[PDB]
Structure 1
Amino acid sequence: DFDDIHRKRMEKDLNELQALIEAHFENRKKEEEELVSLKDRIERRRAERAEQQRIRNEREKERQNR
């Protein structure tokens, strides 16, 4: 007894810390930069949609104005 405390504690004392650091690094890398880039891409597409909407609205208002 009291000799399995080493073999159940020291293991996770380093392996768990290193593995969680690895998980945090990979998750941040996968998540943050890709999300910001994708949001910028969607913003550009949204601006293009806004331009298309403005053009169509203006041309239809020009024709229909009677």
Structure 2
Amino acid sequence: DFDDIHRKRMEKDLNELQALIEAHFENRKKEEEELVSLKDRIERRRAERAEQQRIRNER
């Protein structure tokens, strides 16, 4: 009936919506991984700046 096609329509709506939901989940997840790697290289930069600054100060 009209209820049947309405149900199938909201069904495929839910399907595409959860699909895009998981999709942006994955996208923002990759972005968070990239940002974590950024933080890691950032702490590497902190440590290297600290050691070279300390060497400069020692001299």
**Partner deviation per Cα, 1:12-66 (whole Å, 9 max, x = no partner):** 6324423332333222322212111210111111111111011112xxxxxxx99
Aligned CA-pair RMSD: 4.0
Q: Which has the higher helix share?
A: 2
Number of residue equivalences: 59
% same residue: 98
- Unpaired runs of 5+ residues, structure 2, are none
List 4+ stretches of structure 1 deviating above 3 A.
1-5
TM-score, L = length of structure 1:
0.54
1: distance between equivalents of 2:18 and 2:3? 24
2: distance between equivalents of 1:47 and 1:25? 32
Larger of the two Rg values belongs to structure: 1
1: distance between equivalents of 2:37 and 2:3? 52
TM-score, L = length of structure 2:
0.59
